[PDB]
């Protein structure tokens, strides 16, 4: 039965194919249709041009060039390429289909060569006509100008690019020593320069002079720029006669252009209806030879040897399908496939469904896991959106984001088919992430007791106010109980609210951060026991565990303990944990306020334990290796690892404060936004009160969606992502894995 592989990579097997040459082509096609095998390159020593199937590839490469050329012409003349059905062959199903024959492929080769020789001839013949058309129409334009254009051979005239006319008159002014008489007239629309495959604005121009040498120099200057020079009679009758002569010539020319043009399009439309179908077949024919190039060829027995990785549990279907091929051909092939055992690293492969695929991508994006290593995916499914929810805590914003995600989830069958821009495709790909990202946000928003910056009075408060007071008189509440779920709503609007909630959220962030880190660190043990790497248990895991648990685990215990003791009832001074933490390092054995009996005696023990773990972590593994330049490499590696580890414990546990920081900033922004927009509307009364309420809600809601839900939300999301890549995965993730990427056919886009 098929195994689920999400907790660790799927098991892989190495198989060796003995393919007799006579069915090399057919067998390669079937394996491509299965889409399971990933091949090793057995010819890695050989120069690129010496691999055995080089010339076969060259033929198909040349056809591919020609198909690229055809597609260019389709776009030049703006003809839609027809669309083939993506599913006409298969969709990862492993379904067998019959490959094209050799004669069919040779027919593609012949036809593609034939079509290029025709199109390259017809296309150029058409461009030759277009050049004459553009030339005459420019000439026609000048003749159509009024005689006042000529008022001030007596002159030189032509057409020049709009970009350069300013340079022309600058040059001519010097050449003629300021005697320049010069006129310029616009052409109202771009002119087409087919050799440049662009169109440009242009100007008609004329220059006056009598000297022969001067006229000749002016011509050479203008022709050195991209101008075209035209000859025009001085008399209005001459212009009229020449305009008529041109008009006849130009009017005739459209006949030749039209007949050639429609012939050319008739050629293209035949290709446009089938070019995609051709392209898919040729590229797949090209592809299989790129696979066969990786096999090792036994010229004596005429056998191709190919090595490939395959999932362990799907050997059965691989065996069956090649059996179907042998049955179809009717050849007594001797055991085409053989399983193998070698000291090579197999590829990493995780099976996923539509729900898990989004979360797995976020882990693979950082780096591919080592073979059979603990997958970072499963822990990420919950802890990624949840760490987000701790920051993005607000029931209103959580609800709005849930609706957005839920709509994408419900409509997914329609959204899946339509094409998407990547700014929208990422959202759809992550739809199940955002759904949990919203649901957990609603939960944490309830514990913070905050909806759109307002508290919820769901239960009886644990704080009781005085019996009486007057307007503007300061009061203090009396404790009468503990609120059952979340923050007590009595804190709302309270003048010292922040002094409480900051103590709450800061301690929350440290506790959640430490628990998250120590949890994922224990995956390190799960790797070492699986690989039977006993040396790492003694060398790395235990010393690291004692080191961090002995400092920041101890701090976590103290934080929880201080909440359990009733200090005011005992009359004892409540100790400052932060000062206590510092003093146990900088002045061990001395205490200001005791959190519990024998405080000093145990703390000095913890300090000594932490110190002893450093050399233990640093030395034991390298020494074990020497006892059995490798030792030098092992030693220099290990010492750096210790400095990273010991330093990271401080940086990482400190870095988790961002869980508090982004929550506080998010809350205070929301309350100010409410105070400045909707809170204002309640002042007004009457009709203006109605209009202001209508208007200011629209302002409030629009800003809430844009700034808070979308911008501040995504910023909170990416911070929680960084906490996973660095703070968490660095403690159990090795990486450097070879990604599983099998040989499989797909639809080429062109």
């Amino acid at each position: 039965e098929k195994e689920e592989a999400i907790f660790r990579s799927a098991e892989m097997a190495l198989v060796q194919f003995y393919i007799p040459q006579e069915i090399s082509r057919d067998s390669a096609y079937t394996l491509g249709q299965l889409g399971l095998v990933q091949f090793r390159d057995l010819n890695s020593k050989v120069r690129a041009f010496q691999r055995t199937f080089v010339n076969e590839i060259r033929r198909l490469d040349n056809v591919e060039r020609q198909y690229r050329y055809f597609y260019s012409l389709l776009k030049k003349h703006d003809i839609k390429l027809y669309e083939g059905d993506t599913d006409k062959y298969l969709d990862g199903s492993g379904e067998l289909y019959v490959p094209p024959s050799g004669s069919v492929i040779d027919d593609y080769v012949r036809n593609a060569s034939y079509l290029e020789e025709r199109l390259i001839q017809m296309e150029d013949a058409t461009d030759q006509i277009e050049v004459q058309k553009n030339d005459l129409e420019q000439y026609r334009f000048i003749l159509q100008s009024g005689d006042e254009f000529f008022l001030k051979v007596n002159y030189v005239t032509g057409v020049i690019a709009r970009d350069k006319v300013a340079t022309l008159e600058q040059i001519l002014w010097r050449v003629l020593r300021g005697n320049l008489f010069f006129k310029t007239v616009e052409i109202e629309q771009p002119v087409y320069d087919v050799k440049t495959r662009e169109y440009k604005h242009k100007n008609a121009f004329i220059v006056f002079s009598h000297g022969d040498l001067i006229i000749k120099r002016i011509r050479k200057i203008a022709e050195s720029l991209d101008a075209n020079l035209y000859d025009v009679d001085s008399s209005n009758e001459g212009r009229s006669q020449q305009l008529a002569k041109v008009n006849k010539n130009l009017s005739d020319l459209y006949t030749v252009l039209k007949t050639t043009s429609t012939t050319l399009e008739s050629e293209l439309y035949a290709i446009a209806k089938e070019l995609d179908s051709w392209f898919q077949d040729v590229t797949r024919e090209k592809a299989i030879f790129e696979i066969l190039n990786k096999s090792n060829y036994d010229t004596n027995r005429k056998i191709l040897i190919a090595e490939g990785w395959i999932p362990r549990d799907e050997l059965a279907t691989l065996q069956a399908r090649l059996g179907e091929m042998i049955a179809r051909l009717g050849i007594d092939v001797p055991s085409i496939i053989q399983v193998l055992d070698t000291n090579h690293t197999p590829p990493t492969f995780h099976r996923t469904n539509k729900f898990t695929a989004g979360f797995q991508s976020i882990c693979d994006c950082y780096g591919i896991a080592q073979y059979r290593e603990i997958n970072a995916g499963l822990p990420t499914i919950v802890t990624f959106p949840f760490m987000f929810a701790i920051m993005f805590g607000d029931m209103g914003h959580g609800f709005l984001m849930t609706l957005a995600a839920l709509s994408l989830v419900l409509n997914e069958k329609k959204i899946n088919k339509m094409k998407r821009g990547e700014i929208f495709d990422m959202a759809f790909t992550g739809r199940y992430i955002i759904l949990l990202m919203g649901v957990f946000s609603m939960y944490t928003g309830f514990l913070y007791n905050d909806i759109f910056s307002k508290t919820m009075t769901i239960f009886k408060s644990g704080w009781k106010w005085p019996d009486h007071w007057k307007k503007g008189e300061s009061i203090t509440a009396t404790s009468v109980g503990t609120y059952p779920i979340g923050l007590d709503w009595a804190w709302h609007g309270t003048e010292n609210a922040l002094l409480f909630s900051n103590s709450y959220k800061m301690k929350l962030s440290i506790l959640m951060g430490f628990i998250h880190m120590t949890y994922s660190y224990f995956f390190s043990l799960a790797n070492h026991l699986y690989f039977n790497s006993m040396i790492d248990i003694i060398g790395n895991f235990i010393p690291g565990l004692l080191f961090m648990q002995g400092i920041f685990g101890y701090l976590s215990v103290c934080i929880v303990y201080k909440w359990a003791v009733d200090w005011v009832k005992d009359g004892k001074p409540a100790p400052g944990l932060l000062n206590m933490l510092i003093n146990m390092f900088l002045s061990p054995g001395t205490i200001d306020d005791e959190l519990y009996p024998h405080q000093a005696k145990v703390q000095v023990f913890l300090l000594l334990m932490a110190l002893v773990c450093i050399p233990w972590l640093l030395l034991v593994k390298p020494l074990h290796f020497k006892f059995t330049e490798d030792f030098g490499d092992i030693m220099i590696h290990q010492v750096i690892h210790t400095i990273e580890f010991c330093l990271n414990c401080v940086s990482h546990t400190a870095s988790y404060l961002r869980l508090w920081a982004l929550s506080l900033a998010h809350a205070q922004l929301s309350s100010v936004l409410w105070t400045m927009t909707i809170q204002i509307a309640f002042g007004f009364r009457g009709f203006v009160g109605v209009f202001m309420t209508v208007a200011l809600f629209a302002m409030w809601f629009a800003l809430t969606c844009a700034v808070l839900v979308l911008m501040e939300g995504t910023s909170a999301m990416l911070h929680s992502l960084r906490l996973h890549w660095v703070e968490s995965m660095s403690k159990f993730f090795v990486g450097e894995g070879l990604p599983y990427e099998p040989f499989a056919f797909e639809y080429k886009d062109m």
């Binding site: 330093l647 401080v650 660095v726």
Partner: protein, 198 residues
């Protein structure tokens, strides 16, 4: 150059003013000591806290853009570096966390002093303590952030060439990151004995 002319002009003015007070016998008027006694201690404390987070953030921001621009430039040909080198950004960002943490610790001491006790020995001590401690943490984080950022740029551009170089050069980066942590430790020591404003 105008700026250096201004510097010399200020220097000349200060010297001439000093000599004028000195030669006329009133040289005791300048009296830096009295200035330190009469200025309110809340000024020194708040400048210490504000510049602590302020200069620390400048350090992190300055480092990030040096590394970030290099990562984006080198990443055009080799996108693989973009995720692995995020460690370099982290080593820059963390010095802002150190500055933030000190801002939390120092904020706890800004109580309101009784008027009759305003300029007493202990209150002045806390005023000076938080000022120099804040400057120390801030400036050292500013120096650390830039040094790490420069190192990170060379690391990213090396990784794009050969992956084996990255782990070798990161050793220089962690060496750089220690400077900010030592700054934090001295900061907590300088502010250790300072009492709350009584």
């Amino acid at each position: 150059s105008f700026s250096h002319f201004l510097y010399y002009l200020v220097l000349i003015v200060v010297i001439v003013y000093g000599l004028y007070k000195l030669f006329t016998g009133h040289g005791s008027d300048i009296n830096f000591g009295k200035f330190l006694l009469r200025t309110s201690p809340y000024m020194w404390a708040n400048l210490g806290i504000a510049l602590c987070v302020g200069l620390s953030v400048v350090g992190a921001a300055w480092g990030i853009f040096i590394t970030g621009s290099s990562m984006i430039g080198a990443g055009v040909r080799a996108p693989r570096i973009t995720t692995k080198n995020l460690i370099s950004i982290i080593f820059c960002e963390v010095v802002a966390i150190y500055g933030l943490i000190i801002a939390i610790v120092f904020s706890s001491k800004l109580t309101v002093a009784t008027a009759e006790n305003m300029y007493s020995k202990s209150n002045l001590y806390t005023g000076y303590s938080l000022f120099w401690a804040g400057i120390t943490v801030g400036a050292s984080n500013l120096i650390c952030g830039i040094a790490v950022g420069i190192t990170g740029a060379t690391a990213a551009i090396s990784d794009a060439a050969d992956s084996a170089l990255f782990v070798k050069i990161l050793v220089i980066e962690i060496f750089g990151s220690i400077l900010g942590l030592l700054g934090l430790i001295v900061g907590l020591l300088m502010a250790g004995k300072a009492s709350e404003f009584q």
